[PDB]
Subunit: 384 residues, 4 copies
Amino acid sequence: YQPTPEDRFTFGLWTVGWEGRDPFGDATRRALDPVESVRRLAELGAHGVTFHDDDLIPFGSSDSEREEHVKRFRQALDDTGMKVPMATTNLFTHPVFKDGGFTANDRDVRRYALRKTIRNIDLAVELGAETYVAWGGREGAESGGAKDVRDALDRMKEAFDLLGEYVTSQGYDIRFAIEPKPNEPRGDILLPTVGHALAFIERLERPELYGVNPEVGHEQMAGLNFPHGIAQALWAGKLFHIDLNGQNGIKYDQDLRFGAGDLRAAFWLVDLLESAGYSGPRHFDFKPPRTEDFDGVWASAAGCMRNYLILKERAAAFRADPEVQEALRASRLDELARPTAADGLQALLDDRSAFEEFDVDAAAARGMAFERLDQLAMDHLLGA
Amino acid sequence: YQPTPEDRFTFGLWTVGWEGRDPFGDATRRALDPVESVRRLAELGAHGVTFHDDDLIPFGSSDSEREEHVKRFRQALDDTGMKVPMATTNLFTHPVFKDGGFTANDRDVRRYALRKTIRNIDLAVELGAETYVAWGGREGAESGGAKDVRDALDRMKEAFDLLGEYVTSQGYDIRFAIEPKPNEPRGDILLPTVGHALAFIERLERPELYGVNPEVGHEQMAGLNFPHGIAQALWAGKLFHIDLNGQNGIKYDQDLRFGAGDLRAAFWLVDLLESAGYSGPRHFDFKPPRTEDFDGVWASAAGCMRNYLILKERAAAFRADPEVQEALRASRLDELARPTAADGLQALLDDRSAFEEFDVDAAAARGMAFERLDQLAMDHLLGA
Amino acid sequence: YQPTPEDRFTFGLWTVGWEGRDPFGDATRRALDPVESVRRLAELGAHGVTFHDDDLIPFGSSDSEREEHVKRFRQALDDTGMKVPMATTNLFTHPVFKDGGFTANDRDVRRYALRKTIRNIDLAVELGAETYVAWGGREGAESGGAKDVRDALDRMKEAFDLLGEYVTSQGYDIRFAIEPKPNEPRGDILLPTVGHALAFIERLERPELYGVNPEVGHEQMAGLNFPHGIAQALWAGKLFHIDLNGQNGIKYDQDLRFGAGDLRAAFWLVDLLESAGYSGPRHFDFKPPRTEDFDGVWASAAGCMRNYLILKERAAAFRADPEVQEALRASRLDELARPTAADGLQALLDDRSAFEEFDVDAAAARGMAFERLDQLAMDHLLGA
Amino acid sequence: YQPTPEDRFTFGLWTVGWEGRDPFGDATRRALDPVESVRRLAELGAHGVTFHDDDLIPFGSSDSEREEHVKRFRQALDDTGMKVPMATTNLFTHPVFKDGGFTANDRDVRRYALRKTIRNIDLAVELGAETYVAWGGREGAESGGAKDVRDALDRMKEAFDLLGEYVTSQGYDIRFAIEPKPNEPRGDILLPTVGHALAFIERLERPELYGVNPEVGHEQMAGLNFPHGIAQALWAGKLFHIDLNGQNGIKYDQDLRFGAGDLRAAFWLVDLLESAGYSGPRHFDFKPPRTEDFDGVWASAAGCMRNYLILKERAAAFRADPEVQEALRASRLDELARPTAADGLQALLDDRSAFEEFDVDAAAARGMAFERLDQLAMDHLLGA
Ligand SMILES: OC[C@@H](O)[C@H](O)[C@@H](O)CO
Ligand SMILES: OC[C@@H](O)[C@H](O)[C@@H](O)CO
Ligand SMILES: OC[C@@H](O)[C@H](O)[C@@H](O)CO
Ligand SMILES: OC[C@@H](O)[C@H](O)[C@@H](O)CO
Ligand SMILES: [Mg+2]
Ligand SMILES: [Mg+2]
Ligand SMILES: [Mg+2]
Ligand SMILES: [Mg+2]
């Protein structure tokens, strides 16, 4: 289960670079130079890294300091063969964003958030990124009078439409991936789930330019089924990026390494990504726990990839097993994939087997055999 | 706070008619004749009632028994002046539906669910309903191999498309309202939130025919903000029906009377429905607790309406208060409603006040005054 | 991973006998004769069965029908070699219990609940049970005025004290195991967690007679860590029974088979039970999903035991692995087991290494190596 | 609803002094001098303030800086008439505590945490505090191998026993109040609920010296009923302190002002504290949202007290209302307060009205009238 860059594993600079500050805690690790992180991730078999503007260039930097920081980063990329597939903007840390970026009640702040985004789109493109994530972590509220949501959604649409006009004006090849989260750091965050973000995108001026960036722990921290939401994103053709991590339950977002958390959901996730032939990088958005020193940071990163690769093997073995394939037919997964009424409405209406002569008791008595199926799944996950 | 039928309060027959069976409990009340429920609801000042097929006509009824049951119901409607604005199908109680109706793995079941729905659409239309709710309570899974979600969403789209073809073929004026729920009675339910259901509708053949039917406790049992999700539904033009009740938290769906549960969310809900001029009936989908006898059933129904009307008064007083209006300006709710960049992209790009000369520290230092605002809201809710 | 009766796996009659009624659903299976269940469980390698009064004898039975039902059950026990280690009372299904058994507001109901319990204690003893579970599923409330909790706890203490006086008066060898649950079927249930139930027992007249009966999904449906709560029960010497099942999250209690649900917690549970040498039976309190027919019921039962045995092997391999033992020392698990100050208070006060000369920065810089440890755990669970 | 110091409202220095750092955010307010906070809280009608060691004296301070900081603080107390009823230790912020204070795996850290605590107990006593809170926010784990909970509970008992020996050795009048929390900042925290903390205290060497310090949002962030847990604490005689705030749901701990959050639970809380004659200060442990400037900080503080006083009036009006008192009798709250069997075991056993001649159907048919009761409660909370 050793990763190679051909597995397309990517990491944010802010993942392994998290210094361990929390609501109740000072930093437990020193800051990492981005160059060190590129080198150490490449040694572990990562394929690339991703960044926020403020991860690569200290906020408030001069043009000369900006150029220097980018030059050193590109040298480390060249040195390692690491790629930069995705970038994003920090619209959450600085206090100016305390009520939002694109949906801040102050109009001046909204306009600033857009200028800051567009500066970093240009930089993303220069570095070869083809995906641009937007996580509106400060869009939302703690109280009901503070944010008129219809107005905030108008603002949010305006901002994304302006970004789409910008990329089109420049001829850039980049696409946007909007990241839902239900809460934290706002009491409630706008576009709280994959569904709300899919729904919002089809109201944009140029929907083809936008998809979702679901994160495992985000859907889980609302108690939702992450493989289900990924399936709906896939069904819609809108899975433009994914953030992989672990979460134990409905609570604060833990950002555990991938595989930790809800292991059975991680299994079903990998089975789905691999069966659908998802083509995007396997991006980890996780935090090594603040208990760890730097050796533990790199071990937690390595574990992300290891767990992905173990689950990929077990899911493939599950699908290839002739006993599983029989069990899937026993449970009528084949029938689920057949159209209900390719014969058409009128044919259905006139079909006595669908109503007047349907034996409901005989159909109700047929068991679904889902427990045999799932125990096969469990035995394959465990290697039993 | 006495309701009149002019307030457009409606109730499902299955609300006040719930006999009190639960996962661990036998019935605590006898079954109600629909005629009695129409009479008692009309006496309390309700405007109308809604039904599942199986609430009005016992499952398996002959044509003669069906006609009789409908005749007696219509006599009670005529007697009271009650309306029937909405109907729905029971695709969840009978064991035939144990893996779904429209997304059951068995194709024969899928076809049956459609025939059963279409029979009741015809009846809804005969009774004057203009809205048809669909709650796929059995669409989903307890285990990951049992349901391939992409295939189930194809099936689900097929079913809704066939229903749209049917209503169009008949020239009926009725619209569909799809009801999300995150879980219960399946481990995870397909279309678990308002967002997922909005997203799904824009993939249907005739989207204009479908909207959502959000229920207070449904969004709450995923920890989501119900007024926020209603605002997104309103923003999209898709709020076709609403189900009102109370819920205390992320747990099993309690179906408490409206006002019980999260009272501050109930306030913000009513403020939003009334400020947006929502035109649909105020429908209660609730269960009087099984502790209650029939006097308590009617008191719980009455309390639904009373609480709505108290919250309507307090929200109106909040919005009309000149101190509140000042506080809203102090918190820049007016600025939230202004376009970010009506001057256009290029104008924003060339505006030095949005970047090169934006004083981020001065903007960050400006407090939002949300606590003063919310304490005004609290004082108005409490009548203080 | 084939169970034998020497593994001490037990099942409630109401587990495999669940007919599949839910909040929204009629039964999907016919009722099982207890005799059939004993025979089928014994064939799968179970060691024993448990019962509620009402599972073995239909509520309202004559003395002659009671004797007959018990005779047939004992013949099946004799036929198979199955044991009956535990019994309990149904104080939740009949509508008389709608506000409680031992804490019902009606005094007459309280007294009835006690008489019903004591009748079944006598029967439990006759069948050889040494443990008597009490699950006050109806003790609690949906609204705040309905139940004065201090008064209800007085009632609850009175009832348990009377039961202790009864068992002592008769010379019986039986002990009580109080089962917490946070909610469902009441809005909130009294003694909602292992901690609340441990706390309550030390106020009883004869605490030695009572312990807890924690259930996996019960603690999980409050988002709590089930292995942690079992550890506190063990620490206190109060783990008198355990109920094993699976749960996916904070939601309605799903009663999935053991291993399903939170698989990593199931691992850590088995590691703890086995490392502590827990001596009680491994009792499954689960429901085969209503999707299943009878073949699926027995497969779900078998899967309970299989998963226990797989996790037992993997946890034992984890603890025996010399690399794990090194990792545990690296993470100072050995130091956690050493007394903080066996030198005593004054010695600590006078120890400059504990304050005036403690290098806090050097201690803070030492990483905990928990990620290496946990990835070893993950590799052992997966057999990697 | 204007507070006076006679209402015994208290605030932590770290409440109004929170600078607004969060998992994703830099500070939005400058640090407050403790002297300013005492002055501003006294102007709002607070009675006193509470502190962590590190709130009053910067970590690492010389003896001379420690004396200065305490002198200025005492001058502000003298200037205002504010009291210091409670103190606590910071065993969570510094990185040395990243795996715990009293249950850190490193023994040296455990010993340090005890020395740091005892230094601040001496200071608390000097300032007149009679209560000492302990919140083991770092006691717990993110992964299952990292913390053997039985060993950690032994350590935790040792630490509390040593603190009890210390206070007894010095002749101090101070009592300890242990603060449960379920999670955040550890994945799971030891003593996660009021129940677990009550249970733990009765294993200490000198239980009379320890009680609980429940916090509203802590119990709520596990989905538990805070008034219920306070009632059990009261029933046990162990409510030594309370932390008042608001929380919207099972999610990260929001620390909203008191009244915000679950308003109906806040009502029932105040009704219980006032009906039981709780004698301790009404302490607010809350964070003014980081959206706010300093004017908003003081308004959020004021709102804590205002909401308490409004709820106190409404709860008193509820209990005094003759219609409510009738409704309570209708719902048999009077019968709940009567002993079940003061006639004794044998008398119950021989009472045919409790079994052989108990009419279960007639008792089951009696409704509980809880909905009428609760709607009275709702009308009183709303002033309707
Ligand atoms: O919850 C934090 C979010 O996961 C971010 O890390 C975004 O992915 C990128 O800003
Ligand atoms: O959770 C149950 C749902 O609320 C139903 O009552 C639908 O609204 C109608 O079938
Ligand atoms: O939640 C249901 C409880 O688990 C019961 O099955 C008790 O264990 C026994 O009555
Ligand atoms: O969750 C944070 C806790 O509420 C603390 O503020 C303690 O009360 C005191 O350290
Ligand atoms: Mg992310
Ligand atoms: Mg509904
Ligand atoms: Mg149980
Ligand atoms: Mg606190």
